[PDB]
Structure formats: structure tokens, C-alpha cells
Specification:
Chain lengths: 8, 8
């Protein structure tokens, strides 16, 4: 649930 | 370093 440093 | 289920 991440793309790079951005997560949910 | 990861995007979806892929880590680079």
C-alpha cells in the first residue's frame, strides 16, 4: 500500500 | 524503495 514514500 | 508489491 505504498508508492515510494506515500502510503495507506 | 517499494511500489505496490515491487521493491527496487
Amino acid at each position: 500500500x505504498c508508492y515510494x514514500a506515500v502510503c495507506t
